[PDB]
Amino acid sequence: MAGEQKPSSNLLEQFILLAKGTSGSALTALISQVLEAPGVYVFGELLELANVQELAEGANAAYLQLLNLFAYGTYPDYIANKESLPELSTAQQNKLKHLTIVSLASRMKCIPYSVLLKDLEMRNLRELEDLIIEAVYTDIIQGKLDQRNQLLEVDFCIGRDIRKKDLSAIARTLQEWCVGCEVVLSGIEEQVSRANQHKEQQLGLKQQIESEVAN
Amino acid sequence: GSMLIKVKTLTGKEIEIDIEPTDKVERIKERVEEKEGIPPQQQRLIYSGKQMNDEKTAADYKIMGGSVLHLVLALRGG
Amino acid sequence: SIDEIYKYDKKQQQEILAAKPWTKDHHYFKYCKISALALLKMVMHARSGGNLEVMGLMLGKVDGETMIIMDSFALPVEGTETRVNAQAAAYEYMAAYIENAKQVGRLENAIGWYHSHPGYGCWLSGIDVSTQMLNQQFQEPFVAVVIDPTRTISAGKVNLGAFRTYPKGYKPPDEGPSEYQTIPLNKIEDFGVHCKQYYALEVSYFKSSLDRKLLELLWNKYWVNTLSSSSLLTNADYTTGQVFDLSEKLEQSEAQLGRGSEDKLAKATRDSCKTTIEAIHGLMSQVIKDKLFNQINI
Amino acid sequence: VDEDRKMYLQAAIVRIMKARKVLRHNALIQEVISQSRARFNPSISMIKKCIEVLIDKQYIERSQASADEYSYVA
Amino acid sequence: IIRGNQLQEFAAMLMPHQKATTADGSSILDRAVIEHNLLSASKLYNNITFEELGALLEIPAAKAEKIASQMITEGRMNGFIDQIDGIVHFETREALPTWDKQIQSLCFQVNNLLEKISQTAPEWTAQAMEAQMAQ
Amino acid sequence: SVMACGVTGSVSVALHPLVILNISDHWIRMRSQEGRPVQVIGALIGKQEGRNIEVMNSFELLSHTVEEKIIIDKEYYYTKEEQFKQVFKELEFLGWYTTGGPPDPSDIHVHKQVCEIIESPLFLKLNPMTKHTDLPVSVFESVIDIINGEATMLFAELTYTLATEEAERIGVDHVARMTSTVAEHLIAQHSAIKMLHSRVKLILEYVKASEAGEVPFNHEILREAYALCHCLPVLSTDKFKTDFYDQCNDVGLMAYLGTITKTCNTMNQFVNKFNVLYDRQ
Ligand SMILES: [Zn+2]
């Protein structure tokens, strides 16, 4: 319905009315069709509904595990936690791989190939850059293949998930560093209001001296 | 402008302009374009089958009131 | 009021227009009240003019002891700096404009000469000194409104001079500025022939409070553009032309001070320091952006 | 009559074409008609060819803007 | 980037003189498709070798670099090479280029979120406006 | 209130800032002529850069009162442009500014009036008689679509900046301050940065509220902040590191030569006065 970065736009009121009316096993079908929603793998205001709250910790408590994985966890979590979460499709298993990998490139300028080969259990170049190119092909990834650094060049990242909340701490760390660079640059500003304002005064007075030298 | 000459397009558009008896047709071009949007560099000023130098005075070619400063000029301006 | 000077009293303005104080003293006009239309298309049409010299009619008025430039700008033309009375040919512009400008209450009339020497000024050269002198004996109050486009590019300040040239018979009195300026070979001789036949007007600027608020708010989102210049890449070649020109000027300062254009060595030291300052401040802004955005470490 | 009129016209035509660049196709040919009202009745078509003749000599070029409405060159 | 029997059905769309095909056996449209294919790969990618990109394209690395040099025997190619190291290269566009890339990248990203919330919080738009007038 | 909520056009022109001042100046002109804040018209032009609009240059016009409506005296404006298109050919009539409250059917009407010289023109609204803290410029543009069986145009707003001309910027810096030239330079930096600073600070404020309380919990808030913190210092790369060694070494040896220029001019004057008093120059 609404439109910015998100999965298939049906999903919002789609799963609103689904969890509203589909519950238990109908809630499981709800979840199964939730599973393919990439840009919203996390449902903060969609788990706002008590229907998803019973989705969570109901029969599908493992699915709330998976949802928080999207919010918090990674696919390599599943590589360890192969049984904790609900089932996933190979497409969706690679989707959780893309979870952790978009989070990684979110971290670094460019994540190494071997990094995701190992954490995401990726064996070889072929499948590696297959899922890589499909991630970039989602257009989440700008930049290019950082082969020489054995990385992936990254110029732009679309938001992966809703990623339940460091939100407060996130925005306040943002406020912190914003103000920090601001104050660095503002100390510069007033050093400028010193120096070549001092340059104005200095040369003005020096020229006064030179003019008074005559008579 | 003391000299009130005519700048004429290929179709005969003779324009009344105030210039001087030493007024540069270099700036007479400026005048024709500042007056008619038709810019002067395809307002090729030709005098009697032979071009008028874009860098000259109108009166250099004994140009006067009913004299003609050729455009060949453009249509989109007009 | 801040709008008290934007008031174009066509009564008062055209009154002092017909006042002819210059025929009593050709040094009456000491001020030049300007609205920023001069700066507007003077600047961006000397720059958009590339290197093509231009000419025409300025909007304006007169106030007290003040010429007033409501307008000055360029053409998409050439030939100025060498035309026999260039400017005239663009007056057709406000041969029409001002006329039905009165239809909107722009009851102003024509006052001056818009122009630009793209890259090397806005003035009247040797043949245009014929222009300037003849026309000030033709058209006084007349001005040599002088600002250089590429000088105002690598300079950061608008050296505006309203140069009412000293008419034939009227010599520079106590106040003749006569802004000496480095001229190409075409007109430097005739500038030496006529460098001291003009004075400058005290060119002030007038506006509204809305004008100031608009410029501040301009900056208030242009600062992002400020940190996105990349102009060291822009005219590094311009710096190179200055390289050659400066080694040349030191050659000529050499040739002057050899045995015996005044003291080309000192003038050359001056201009060298100047242009180096120019390139250095360009590098300043660029290193500014660089160190800022490149010292942002995660 | 046909060869001497054609020669007289080539010169009158190039000279116009240098003076003002019309230059259009259609309007141009019409204006050409206007200049030589006295001479004789020309072909409305061949208007095309007319400009064509001047296109070759490096006298006037063909602009991008229209099949008509070209530009003057040289 | 679609593959062989992903559109071998397009064989049915083709024409007999066209379904009569080329010397190397990649038909006229096949290699056309490879121009198309690799062009996608090309416009995409930074730098790759030819055992890499040939196994990618299921084809000889010989052919890969070979007909690369042919792909520029068109002159529709842009990039550069090492024959010996057997590599082609993306470019990192690195600099001032990438600088303003993500400069105005963040500009649009920030203004996207700004006006998203200004429309989701036009009331809070007014409130933030109030506090910023205080600012 | 017949407006139509649409999309972009064909804007790109060049700018100088006193024509913004001539937005001011037409309002002052018609106001002094009528003794009242006059809802005026003015010939908007601007930059069009990809998907960005920049509504910049618009001076005095003719705004007649047709019984309630602002009116571009259309053929009057035709006269006017031919009165300046001779020499102002570097600028094209993008739209019209005015002065009043929000956009009204008279503003819609003269915007349509601007929609008759071209197909998709722009709309600007200024007012010194309105009551905002922002730079008073509203900017509208057009789609053509089908709704409720009616085929209609569509006019909606997009955001701008202002010109980037060198001497223009210098004049902006002065006429803002009107007194130190990079100071007269960096204050354009300061102004734009403070403007977007208010922007992303309002962002910061309603953001902080999100995590605080009573303000909507969305997952698309900070998330972008994560993107930002991975947008940190671009090009660590050593590429630009060498590049900037290059740049600063160039300018610095330039300055070194200028240590040359300065002290050599000093030296020549010294040799002069040495040839002045020690010698017969
Ligand atoms: Zn002259």
**What ranges in C140-263 are assigned the alpha helix state H?**
185-194, 209-226, 236-257
Would you give the distance in Å from CA A128 to the centre of its chain? 21
Query: Are F110 and F73 a contacting pair, CB within 8 Å?
Result: no
The encoded tokens of residue C238 equal 């311009």
Q: Is A99 helix (H, G, I), strand (E, B) or coil?
A: helix
Residue B13 Cα, gap to closest chain C Cα (Å)? 15
Residue F81 Cα, gap to closest chain B Cα (Å)? 8
CB atoms within 10 A of CB F136: 21
Query: In the β-sheet with B3-8, what is the strand arrangement from edge to edge?
Result: B14-19, B3-8, B68-70
DSSP structure string for C171-192? ---S----------HHHHHHHH
d(CA E47, CA B59): 68
DSSP-derived pairing of the beta strands B3-8 and B68-70: parallel
The encoded tokens of residue C167 equal 């008419």
For residue F214, report the phi and psi dihedrals to the nearest 5 degrees: 55, 40
DSSP-derived pairing of the beta strands C198-201 and C161-165: antiparallel
Resolution in angstroms, to 1 decimal, for this deposition? 5.9
- Rg of the Cα trace of chain D? 12
**What's C102's DSSP letter?**
G
Length of chain A: 215
Query: Are C65 and F45 a contacting pair, CB within 8 Å?
Result: no
| Cα A134 to ligand 1 centroid, rounded to whole Å | 68
d(CA F189, CA F204): 21
Q: Is F214 helix (H, G, I), strand (E, B) or coil?
A: coil
Q: Is E58 helix (H, G, I), strand (E, B) or coil?
A: coil
**Chain E residues inside the 8 Å CB shell of A125:** 52
Would you give the distance in Å from CA C291 to the centre of its chain? 35
Which long-range CB contacts under 8 A does E74-80 form with residues at least 24 apart?
E76/E35, E76/E39, E77/E42, E79/E42
d(CA E36, CA C117): 52
| Cα C81 to ligand 1 centroid, rounded to whole Å | 6
Q: Residues with Cβ < 8 Å from E20, sequence gap 6 or more?
A: none
Q: Which residues pair with D72 in a beta bridge?
A: D60
Query: Are E64 and E48 a contacting pair, CB within 8 Å?
Result: no
Residue type at position C185: L
Q: Residues with Cβ < 8 Å from E47, sequence gap 6 or more?
A: A145, A147, A148, E87, E88, E89, E90
Which residue has tokens 């850069």?
F49
- The CA-CA-CA angle for residues C65, C70, C76, to 5°, reads 135
**What's C275's DSSP letter?**
H
d(CA A213, CA A208): 9
Q: Residues with Cβ < 8 Å from A10, sequence gap 6 or more?
A: A1
DSSP structure string for E21-34? --SSSS-HHHHHHH
| Cα C29 to ligand 1 centroid, rounded to whole Å | 23
Residue B5: enclosing H or E segment and its boundaries? strand B3-8
**What ranges in F134-237 are assigned the alpha helix state H?**
166-177, 181-212, 223-229
Judged by a CB distance cut-off of 8 A, whether residue E111 touches chain A is no
**Chain C residues inside the 8 Å CB shell of E100:** 228, 230
**Which method was it determined by?**
cryo-EM
Query: Are C87 and C55 a contacting pair, CB within 8 Å?
Result: yes
Residue D52: enclosing H or E segment and its boundaries? helix D47-56
For residue C266, report the phi and psi dihedrals to the nearest 5 degrees: -70, -45
d(CA C271, CA C243): 11
CB atoms within 10 A of CB F110: 26
d(CA C145, CA C164): 8
Among chain C, residues having any CB pair with chain B shorter than 8 Å are 54-57, 75-80, 82-96, 127, 130-131, 134-135, 138
Q: Which residues pair with C63 in a beta bridge?
A: C66
Buried-exposed string C230-268: b where 16+ CB fall within 10 A, e elsewhere: eebeebeebbeebeeebeebbeebeebbeeeeebbbbbb
| Cα C131 to ligand 1 centroid, rounded to whole Å | 4
Judged by a CB distance cut-off of 8 A, whether residue C292 touches chain A is yes
Nearest to F240, CA basis, from E60, C230, C62, C68: C230
CB atoms within 10 A of CB C179: 14
Whether the link from the prior residue into C141 is cis, omega within 30° of 0, is yes
d(CA F211, CA C28): 69
| Residues within 5 A (CB) of ion ligand 1 | C 83, 127-128, 131
- The CA-CA-CA angle for residues A131, A133, A139, to 5°, reads 115
Judged by a CB distance cut-off of 8 A, whether residue F87 touches chain B is yes
Whole-number Cα distances in Å, F37 to F28, F33, F40, F128, F215: 8, 10, 9, 8, 39
Query: Are F49 and F18 a contacting pair, CB within 8 Å?
Result: no
Please report the sign of the dihedral spanned by the C-alpha atoms of residue E16, residue E21, residue E26, residue E28.
negative
Query: Are F161 and F54 a contacting pair, CB within 8 Å?
Result: yes
Q: Which residues pair with C60 in a beta bridge?
A: C69, C109
- Specify burial of residue C133 (Cβ count, 10 A radius: 0-12, 13-18, 19+): buried
Query: Are F234 and A143 a contacting pair, CB within 8 Å?
Result: no
Please report the sign of the dihedral spanned by the C-alpha atoms of residue C49, residue C51, residue C57, residue C62.
positive
Please report the sign of the dihedral spanned by the C-alpha atoms of residue C9, residue C10, residue C11, residue C16.
positive
d(CA F193, CA C219): 8
DSSP-derived pairing of the beta strands B46-47 and C144-146: unpaired
**What ranges in E1-135 are assigned the alpha helix state H?**
10-13, 16-19, 28-44, 50-56, 61-74, 96-120, 122-134
d(CA F219, CA A101): 19
d(CA C172, CA A73): 85
Q: Is C111 helix (H, G, I), strand (E, B) or coil?
A: strand
